Amino acid sequence: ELTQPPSVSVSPGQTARITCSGDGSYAGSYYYGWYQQKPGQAPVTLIYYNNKRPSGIPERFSGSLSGSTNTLTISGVQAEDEADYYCGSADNSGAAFGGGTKLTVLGQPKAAPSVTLFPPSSEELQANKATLVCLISDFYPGAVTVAWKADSSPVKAGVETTTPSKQSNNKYAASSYLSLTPEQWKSHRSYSCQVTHEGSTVEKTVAPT
Amino acid sequence: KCQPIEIPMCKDIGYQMTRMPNLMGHENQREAAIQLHEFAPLVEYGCHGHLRFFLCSLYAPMCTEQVSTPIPACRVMCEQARLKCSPIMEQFNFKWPDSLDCRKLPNKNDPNYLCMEAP
C-alpha cells in the first residue's frame, strides 16, 4: 500500500525528489521517516517524524508531508547520495516500509580497473588443487567483461566471476576465479586474466615456478 | 474485577465500569482524575472531536468480564480529537501531551489489539 517510484535519475547538483504515498482515504494523520541504504551497508536514517533531520545528516536532505504523501527532497545531489531510499510509515496492517527507490546519480567520472592476479599457492598445489585469483578494483561504471587465456588461447571452462559491487569510494569491485588442476597449471606456458572495461583492456599474466 | 467509574469526567458515557491501573499508568481513579483535570476546560468547550470518549477510553478504560485487556480508542480517534481541538488548544496555550502520542494506538482491523470507535 505504501508506494514509491522504483527509480529516479538526477545529474549532480540538481534536486532529486522521492515520494512515499499512503492511503489518502484515511481520515487521520500520517507519519513518515526516510532511510538511506548503500549496497552492503545498514540503513542510515535521514528524516524522521515527517520533517526532522538527525544531526550529522547533511542539510541538503529534507522531508515534507502533503496530504498522504511525504516527499524526500535532495537539493544539490552528490555522487555519494547514490543509494536505495525507503520510507518508513504504517500500512493498514501496521508498521511498514515503502518498496524502495533506487536513486541514480548521472555523469560520474569513468575510472579504469586495477587488476591483481595471484597464482596458486604452494599449499593449494600440495592439496592437489589450483586456483588463479583475479581481483578487479576501482572501476566506473560497473560493467566489465573478464576473459581468461591459457597461453594465448581462450579458457572455456572453470571460470567463476562475480557481479560487480560498489566499493566504499563508490567505484566497483569484482573477482574472477579460474579453477585448475596442478597438472594444467604446470603444463601451460602461462595464464592471463584480461579485463575489458569501456572498450579498453587491462591484462595480467602469471606462470608456474 | 471491575469497579464503578469515579472519575467525574468519565461518568455517564455509556459504560459504567473501569479497572485500575488505567492505560496511562495511574494506580487509582483519584490519581487519574487529577491528571485529567488539565483537560476539563477543553471537554466542556465543545471542540466536536469526541475528546471525552477518547480521553476516557485511556484514563477510565471500559472493563467487562467479556474481554481481558482494555480496548483503547483507535488511533484515528486520537488524531481527529487532536486536530479538531487543535485551534481551541492554541487559544488556551495547551500543548497536546507526549503521553497521548497517537502513533501508539492501534487502528481498526488489527486482530490482536482491538480498538473502539465513538458511539
Next chain:
Amino acid sequence: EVQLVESGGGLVQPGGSLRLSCAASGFTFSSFNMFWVRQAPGKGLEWVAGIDDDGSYPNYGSAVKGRATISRDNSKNTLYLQMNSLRAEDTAVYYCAKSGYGGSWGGYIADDIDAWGQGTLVTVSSASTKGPSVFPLAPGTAALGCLVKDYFPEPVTVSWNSGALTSGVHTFPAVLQSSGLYSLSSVVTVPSSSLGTQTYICNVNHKPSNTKVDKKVEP
C-alpha cells in the same frame, strides 16, 4: 552515538527455528520501543516485529505473525527475536532497530527509527554447511592476501593480524560458484619495506561450520 549488535544468525533448515539477540548500548534502553527489520537478498526493508519499553504490546508484520515472538530484557539491555516454521523466504539480514520514542498500546509506525544494527544473516536452506579451505596469497607497496575457498553459507569474517591491521585491507565480495559453494579473497596492501620484518596473518572465521584458521602470508 548508539550501538546495536545482533547475534544468532546462521544456517537453519526449513521448518526449523531461529533465535536472534541484540545488545544495545549508548542510550537508556528501557525508554524506547525496539524493532526487528529484515531484508531478503536483493529486496527491500520489511518490518518484522516491534515491542514497547516494558515489553507489553508486541506486534508483528504479516509474514511472521503467529510464528514469531519479540521480547526484551531491560536488565541486560537486550532485545530478542524467536521464529518458528522457517520458510526459505525467511532468508534475510535481520536488523535490530531502535525507535526514537517509547510507548505503545499495540500500535507501531516506522516513522522514527533512529539507530540501526549491522544486521545478522539467517540462511534458510536444505543445503549442508561446508567450511572453507584457506590459502595464503603471497606477494613501494605489495599486495598480499588469503583465499577463502568453497564454503556455505555466508558470511565469513576475515581480519588481519588479529584485528590489529586495518589500514590497506580490502575483503572482496564472495563469488557464488555454479556448485553452490562460495569463495572470497581478502587483500591487504602493505609497504614493501615491511615484507622482511612484519608478519602478516589472516584470521578467517566461518561460524556456521565452526572454522577458525590463522594463515601466515609469507614471500
